[PDB]
Design an enzyme around this catalytic site. Structure first.
Site, mmCIF file in Angstrom:
data_model
loop_
_atom_site.group_PDB
_atom_site.id
_atom_site.type_symbol
_atom_site.label_atom_id
_atom_site.label_comp_id
_atom_site.label_asym_id
_atom_site.label_seq_id
_atom_site.Cartn_x
_atom_site.Cartn_y
_atom_site.Cartn_z
ATOM 1 N N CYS B 108 -24.863 9.092 -9.875
ATOM 2 C CA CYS B 108 -24.887 10.847 -8.675
ATOM 3 C C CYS B 108 -25.505 10.478 -7.335
ATOM 4 O O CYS B 108 -26.693 10.804 -7.835
ATOM 5 C CB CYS B 108 -25.656 11.669 -9.903
ATOM 6 S SG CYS B 108 -25.266 13.586 -9.288
ATOM 7 N N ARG B 111 -28.035 14.624 -6.743
ATOM 8 C CA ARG B 111 -29.044 14.644 -7.749
ATOM 9 C C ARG B 111 -29.922 15.818 -6.684
ATOM 10 O O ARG B 111 -30.950 15.779 -7.686
ATOM 11 C CB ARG B 111 -29.206 13.466 -8.243
ATOM 12 C CG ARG B 111 -28.665 12.756 -9.396
ATOM 13 C CD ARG B 111 -29.511 11.740 -10.304
ATOM 14 N NE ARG B 111 -29.082 10.731 -9.037
ATOM 15 C CZ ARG B 111 -29.096 8.975 -9.136
ATOM 16 N NH1 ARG B 111 -30.174 9.119 -9.821
ATOM 17 N NH2 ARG B 111 -28.904 8.399 -8.443
ATOM 18 N N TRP B 280 -20.559 20.889 -7.723
ATOM 19 C CA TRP B 280 -19.385 21.621 -7.179
ATOM 20 C C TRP B 280 -19.010 19.904 -6.427
ATOM 21 O O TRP B 280 -19.586 19.038 -6.209
ATOM 22 C CB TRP B 280 -19.798 22.404 -5.925
ATOM 23 C CG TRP B 280 -21.354 21.665 -4.812
ATOM 24 C CD1 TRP B 280 -21.520 21.392 -4.188
ATOM 25 C CD2 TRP B 280 -22.086 22.180 -5.676
ATOM 26 N NE1 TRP B 280 -22.659 20.356 -3.625
ATOM 27 C CE2 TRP B 280 -23.033 21.378 -4.380
ATOM 28 C CE3 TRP B 280 -22.938 23.146 -6.371
ATOM 29 C CZ2 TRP B 280 -24.817 22.071 -5.164
ATOM 30 C CZ3 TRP B 280 -24.484 23.834 -6.328
ATOM 31 C CH2 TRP B 280 -25.381 23.164 -5.504
ATOM 32 N N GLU B 285 -13.884 13.259 -3.045
ATOM 33 C CA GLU B 285 -13.395 13.295 -4.119
ATOM 34 C C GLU B 285 -11.553 12.673 -4.741
ATOM 35 O O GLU B 285 -10.801 12.890 -5.187
ATOM 36 C CB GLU B 285 -14.351 13.532 -5.393
ATOM 37 C CG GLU B 285 -15.867 13.541 -5.916
ATOM 38 C CD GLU B 285 -16.335 14.407 -7.109
ATOM 39 O OE1 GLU B 285 -16.496 13.932 -7.641
ATOM 40 O OE2 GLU B 285 -17.225 14.894 -6.131
HETATM 41 C C1 HEM Z 1 -24.518 19.131 -7.860
HETATM 42 C C2 HEM Z 1 -22.960 18.807 -7.238
HETATM 43 C C3 HEM Z 1 -22.861 17.423 -7.443
HETATM 44 C C4 HEM Z 1 -22.000 16.876 -7.083
HETATM 45 C C5 HEM Z 1 -22.020 17.065 -5.662
HETATM 46 C C6 HEM Z 1 -21.796 15.177 -7.350
HETATM 47 C C7 HEM Z 1 -21.847 14.398 -6.884
HETATM 48 C C8 HEM Z 1 -21.143 13.985 -8.018
HETATM 49 C C9 HEM Z 1 -20.340 12.067 -7.634
HETATM 50 C C10 HEM Z 1 -19.159 12.077 -5.973
HETATM 51 C C11 HEM Z 1 -20.035 11.815 -8.350
HETATM 52 C C12 HEM Z 1 -19.006 10.486 -8.368
HETATM 53 C C13 HEM Z 1 -18.076 10.945 -9.699
HETATM 54 C C14 HEM Z 1 -17.059 10.028 -9.261
HETATM 55 O O1 HEM Z 1 -16.920 9.414 -8.854
HETATM 56 O O2 HEM Z 1 -16.117 9.587 -10.854
HETATM 57 C C15 HEM Z 1 -21.006 12.171 -9.855
HETATM 58 C C16 HEM Z 1 -21.570 11.423 -10.617
HETATM 59 C C17 HEM Z 1 -22.167 11.534 -12.142
HETATM 60 N N1 HEM Z 1 -22.714 12.831 -12.046
HETATM 61 FE FE1 HEM Z 1 -22.937 14.666 -10.473
HETATM 62 N N2 HEM Z 1 -22.576 16.151 -8.864
HETATM 63 C C18 HEM Z 1 -23.905 17.136 -8.810
HETATM 64 C C19 HEM Z 1 -23.795 17.866 -9.915
HETATM 65 C C20 HEM Z 1 -23.992 17.350 -11.416
HETATM 66 C C21 HEM Z 1 -24.069 17.549 -12.518
HETATM 67 C C22 HEM Z 1 -24.377 19.737 -12.888
HETATM 68 C C23 HEM Z 1 -24.207 16.346 -13.619
HETATM 69 C C24 HEM Z 1 -24.967 16.862 -14.937
HETATM 70 C C25 HEM Z 1 -25.760 17.927 -14.813
HETATM 71 C C26 HEM Z 1 -23.737 15.441 -11.754
HETATM 72 C C27 HEM Z 1 -24.223 14.183 -13.512
HETATM 73 C C28 HEM Z 1 -23.353 12.982 -13.306
HETATM 74 C C29 HEM Z 1 -23.023 12.089 -13.765
HETATM 75 C C30 HEM Z 1 -23.303 11.486 -15.165
HETATM 76 C C31 HEM Z 1 -21.978 11.443 -13.347
HETATM 77 C C32 HEM Z 1 -21.410 10.008 -13.930
HETATM 78 C C33 HEM Z 1 -20.330 10.116 -14.099
HETATM 79 C C34 HEM Z 1 -19.288 8.652 -15.056
HETATM 80 O O3 HEM Z 1 -20.532 7.917 -15.281
HETATM 81 O O4 HEM Z 1 -18.397 9.422 -15.201
HETATM 82 N N3 HEM Z 1 -23.713 15.424 -11.743
HETATM 83 N N4 HEM Z 1 -21.943 12.860 -8.960
HETATM 84 C C1 LIG Z 2 -13.467 4.189 -17.720
HETATM 85 C C2 LIG Z 2 -14.577 5.907 -17.261
HETATM 86 C C3 LIG Z 2 -16.045 5.498 -17.214
HETATM 87 C C4 LIG Z 2 -17.315 5.964 -16.781
HETATM 88 N N1 LIG Z 2 -18.493 6.413 -16.951
HETATM 89 N N2 LIG Z 2 -16.377 7.525 -16.293
HETATM 90 C C5 LIG Z 2 -15.377 7.642 -15.454
HETATM 91 C C6 LIG Z 2 -14.611 8.432 -15.644
HETATM 92 C C7 LIG Z 2 -14.010 8.565 -14.679
HETATM 93 C C8 LIG Z 2 -14.514 8.159 -12.868
HETATM 94 N N3 LIG Z 2 -14.130 8.804 -10.925
HETATM 95 C C9 LIG Z 2 -12.299 9.456 -11.377
HETATM 96 C C10 LIG Z 2 -12.746 8.971 -13.331
HETATM 97 O O1 LIG Z 2 -14.028 10.322 -12.861
HETATM 98 C C11 LIG Z 2 -13.544 11.864 -13.784
HETATM 99 C C12 LIG Z 2 -14.353 13.428 -12.943
HETATM 100 N N4 LIG Z 2 -14.887 13.480 -11.328
HETATM 101 C C13 LIG Z 2 -16.379 13.328 -11.565
HETATM 102 C C14 LIG Z 2 -16.663 14.919 -11.189
HETATM 103 F F1 LIG Z 2 -14.675 15.427 -10.607
HETATM 104 F F2 LIG Z 2 -16.228 15.869 -11.758
HETATM 105 C C15 LIG Z 2 -17.209 15.298 -10.461
HETATM 106 C C16 LIG Z 2 -17.997 15.409 -9.288
HETATM 107 C C17 LIG Z 2 -18.862 16.188 -8.609
HETATM 108 F F3 LIG Z 2 -18.889 15.813 -7.193
HETATM 109 C C18 LIG Z 2 -19.168 16.844 -9.743
HETATM 110 C C19 LIG Z 2 -19.530 16.589 -10.575
HETATM 111 CL CL1 LIG Z 2 -20.379 17.652 -11.623
HETATM 112 C C20 LIG Z 2 -18.537 15.827 -11.319
HETATM 113 C C21 LIG Z 2 -14.981 6.641 -16.354
#
Ligand code: HEM
Ligand SMILES: Cc1cc(N)nc(C[C@@H]2CNC[C@@H]2OCCNCC(F)(F)c2cc(F)cc(Cl)c2)c1
Ligand code: HEM
Ligand SMILES: Cc1cc(N)nc(C[C@@H]2CNC[C@@H]2OCCNCC(F)(F)c2cc(F)cc(Cl)c2)c1
Ligand SMILES: C[C@H](O)[C@H](O)[C@H]1CNc2nc(N)[nH]c(=O)c2N1
Ligand SMILES: C[C@H](O)[C@H](O)[C@H]1CNc2nc(N)[nH]c(=O)c2N1
Ligand SMILES: [Zn+2]
Lengths: 407, 411
Positions: B108, B111, B280, B285
């Site tokens: 993330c 953070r 947000w 994305e």
């Molecule tokens: C405040 C605005 C936030 C922004 C701009 C942001 C940004 C991002 C982005 C760009 C990703 C990559 C997502 C992807 O490629 O699928 C991500 C992943 C992630 N974020 Fe954030 N984030 C935010 C808030 C949060 C919040 C509130 C949480 C939980 C309380 C969180 C927890 C996570 C987690 C667990 C991942 C890994 C997701 C996965 O493995 O699929 N984030 N973050």
């Molecule tokens: C196999 C697999 C493993 C893993 N850990 N995550 C995924 C999810 C995959 C990883 N990129 C494509 C698909 O995410 C959909 C959700 N994308 C993040 C978000 F849009 F929800 C998001 C963006 C952001 F700025 C803030 C928040 Cl809170 C949430 C797939």
């Protein structure tokens, strides 16, 4: 033990076995991944030799044959007696090609078997090193039709007698730190340029001064040579639509040639081993021109394009970055100097990965280096899982000579 | 032991001691790096250590380590575990846990905001209907008419693993995908199989390009139930470009609220299998991944075709050109509508400032480079040049298998 890599855009899944024959250490543990870190006697030598000669005889469908045993015997006798050994030419060629094949950071490895190898193991002086290098440059350059090549100088002995090319690439532009505080030329080479001038180079003090070669033979103090100007092919940078682009006064060299790496074959270490292929466009247009600590030209270009530079969210950097890269490719192509774009190169690498999984059971790849520095996710490599591990023969990065060498 | 990271643009060197508190495994070994791999019922025995570690962390944070309150709480949890095989977090512990899971989320880039997170305690929920209502409130609170606020909703923890709460959707708001007999997809390709499940569950699919999917909610291990989110709660942004007026005619829109619902929150050994959270968007994305992945809306061609780019050779960089314009459009649109969005230049610079702050105050910040670096313009963002250490701290969010693979249907 058998590991899967999945491509997230195609669903294609590959099975890696090749990693089990993994030689060295990655930098990672079960507790910590160091995937993004740039730098994570007679006894030892014989297993090293044997392991290599075993893969060699295996590759020529001659494993466990008399000629194999014979060679293993010969090399063993040589080590016991001399404390080192000499590669046969065929072994040397095979090993260099494989160090390239095993280079997990190299996207261009579809070409691995087309490597012309120049055996410079009979070289003894810096002037000799220079003759060899000019020949490598002319051969590889080929009037714009670039051919891959490596030139291999004499192997490490007692380590007090190394051959080194002090330059990190055979061809690179000078960098000088200026009175008014900014940097003239390439800021990457400030230190090196100074060691050249303190060794006596008369710097023109320009922006694109091709550096002199600094060559160390037989552990001797290194010497300066100018590469013949007519051997250095350069490309003026223009844009197919922006007439003003040419006015920035940008050029780059056609020949990328890494000269600070160490080639390890069957336990033997070739400390001077300059090698070369041809550019992927993004190397010059993204990294060389736009890195903040490099030529750092985005602001000037953005300005000429009259973009909104007041807010990051107008993506003016992004827009300017792309046009700069269009211009690099356009220029090389118009001057018929070989260049590949990141789309075609990454496409090639995926094809290469599949061949290597099919034919070899795997392909070490370092995702952090393989994915181009712009447009990641629109290249196939972005969505390809890769396993990174260290196989031998290999290229390894080594300390700058000036840290080690005493004068 | 100390570990150093370097920034190759700035030559700042940082020292990580925090990795010494790392619990889980990475997937890597001394022989293999799996840094680009996407995915690299308990008993009492393994549970009290986990509870203990956590409560020790919690009690340090509040400057009460070793206090009587700390010891009473340790004994009380101990006793609860021996007597019921589980335990219940206090509100303050839940809040702190949920905050630290985000803080520890190495993938993330967002953070810097970890400490401002609104926690909704939904541990009293018993039914799917109750889950719906909690989720609508979350969505309305987080949305806040485009002035987005980060929030998490926490449903009851796992017990025997037969009574799991789950949100079957991967995010609360996402568009349906419908695969056509001709082999093409209408809507989002990523969501096809889930759309199928929804339709089998009785959803009446409009079969358009941007149909918001219904929530499918599982309470207490029960069969999941369909709910339509009230449309007046789903904020959406129609996509247009500042200079190109034909852009709006591509018909594109997106929702403003990214809300991940398919992850598992672990706190002190407890497993919260439904903890939808939201923040947000970073523009890339939507602009890079959602619109331009070949396996998603795949709009690159139409955009370049309309831009009249030279599309006959990859080396014209037509794809790169169209990609920038699409990304300019998404940010322009969100901004014009006053929906919170961050661009990748701004988010990665904030991340670097957060990361350094964490090294000073926390002793480290685990970060996953493959994920933090944006999927376009990698090297002109400061994270590209930043060495990072990836490792796993708890509390944490974990990927969990899609529920339709595991679920025992009760009919
Ligand atoms: C405040 C605005 C936030 C922004 C701009 C942001 C940004 C991002 C982005 C760009 C990703 C990559 C997502 C992807 O490629 O699928 C991500 C992943 C992630 N974020 Fe954030 N984030 C935010 C808030 C949060 C919040 C509130 C949480 C939980 C309380 C969180 C927890 C996570 C987690 C667990 C991942 C890994 C997701 C996965 O493995 O699929 N984030 N973050
Ligand atoms: C196999 C697999 C493993 C893993 N850990 N995550 C995924 C999810 C995959 C990883 N990129 C494509 C698909 O995410 C959909 C959700 N994308 C993040 C978000 F849009 F929800 C998001 C963006 C952001 F700025 C803030 C928040 Cl809170 C949430 C797939
Ligand atoms: C023929 C066309 C070639 C292409 C397009 C190419 C491409 C690349 C690229 C883009 C990189 C990343 C380098 C960087 O970002 O600094 C790289 C790294 C590398 N390539 Fe190649 N390559 C080619 C030929 C070669 C050859 C001939 C060799 C050796 C025989 C080689 C071995 C390596 C090595 C060892 C690295 C890592 C260097 C380092 O760690 O700094 N490649 N390659
Ligand atoms: C500390 C450190 C470690 C390491 N392994 N490499 C470097 C060198 C750093 C790593 N990226 C930038 C700088 O080298 C540029 C030269 N490398 C590639 C090339 F440009 F020369 C090249 C490109 C190509 F297409 C083909 C070839 Cl054969 C060579 C530094
Ligand atoms: C194979 C690779 O890990 C996979 O494509 C990753 C690469 N980096 C990513 N980075 C982010 N932020 N999100 C992703 O979905 C991915 N996908
Ligand atoms: C810290 C990080 O490893 C460093 O910036 C890397 C990232 N990826 C790279 N990729 C390539 N091809 N070349 C590089 O020089 C780098 N630099
Ligand atoms: Zn690793």
């Amino acid at each position: 033990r058998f590991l899967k890599v999945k491509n997230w855009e195609t669903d294609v899944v590959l099975t890696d076995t090749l990693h089990l024959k993994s030689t060295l250490e990655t930098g990672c543990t079960e507790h910590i991944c160091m995937g993004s870190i740039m730098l994570p006697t007679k006894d030892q030598l014989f297993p090293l030799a044997k392991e290599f000669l075993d893969q060699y005889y295996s590759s020529i469908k001659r494993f466990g044959s008399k000629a194999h045993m014979d060679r293993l015997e010969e090399v063993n006798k040589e080590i016991e007696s001399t404390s080192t050994y000499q590669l046969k030419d065929t072994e040397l060629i095979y090993g260099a090609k494989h160090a390239w094949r095993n280079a997990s950071r190299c996207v261009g490895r579809i070409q691995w078997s087309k490597l012309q190898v120049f055996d410079a193991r009979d070289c003894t002086t810096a002037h000799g090193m220079f003759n060899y290098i000019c020949n490598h440059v002319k051969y590889a350059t080929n009037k714009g039709n670039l051919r891959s090549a490596i030139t291999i100088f004499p192997q490490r002995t007692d380590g007090k007698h190394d051959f080194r090319v002090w330059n990190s690439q055979l061809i690179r532009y000078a960098g000088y730190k200026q009175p008014d505080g900014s940097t003239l030329g390439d800021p990457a080479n400030v230190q090196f340029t100074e060691i050249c001038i303190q060794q006596g180079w008369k710097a023109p003090r320009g922006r694109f001064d091709v550096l002199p070669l600094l060559l160390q033979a037989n552990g001797n103090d290194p010497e300066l040579f100018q590469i013949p100007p007519e051997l250095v092919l350069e490309v003026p940078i223009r844009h197919p639509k922006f007439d003003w682009f040419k006015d920035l006064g940008l050029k780059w060299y056609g020949l990328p040639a890494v000269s600070n790496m160490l080639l390890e074959i069957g336990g033997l270490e070739f400390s001077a081993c300059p090698f070369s292929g041809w550019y992927m466009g993004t190397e010059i247009g993204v990294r060389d021109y736009c890195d903040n600590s490099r030529y750092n030209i985005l602001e000037e270009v953005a300005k000429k394009m009259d973009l909104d530079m007041r807010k990051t969210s107008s993506l003016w950097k992004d827009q300017a970055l792309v046009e700069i890269n269009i211009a690099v490719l356009y220029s090389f192509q118009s001057d018929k100097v070989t260049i590949v774009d990141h789309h075609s190169a990454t496409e090639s690498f995926i094809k290469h990965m599949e061949n290597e999984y099919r034919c070899r059971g795997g392909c070490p790849a370092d995702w952090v280096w393989i994915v181009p520095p712009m447009s990641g996710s629109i290249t196939p490599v972005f969505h390809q899982e890769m396993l990174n591990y260290r196989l031998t023969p290999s290229f390894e990065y080594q300390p700058d000579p000036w840290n080690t060498h005493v004068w």
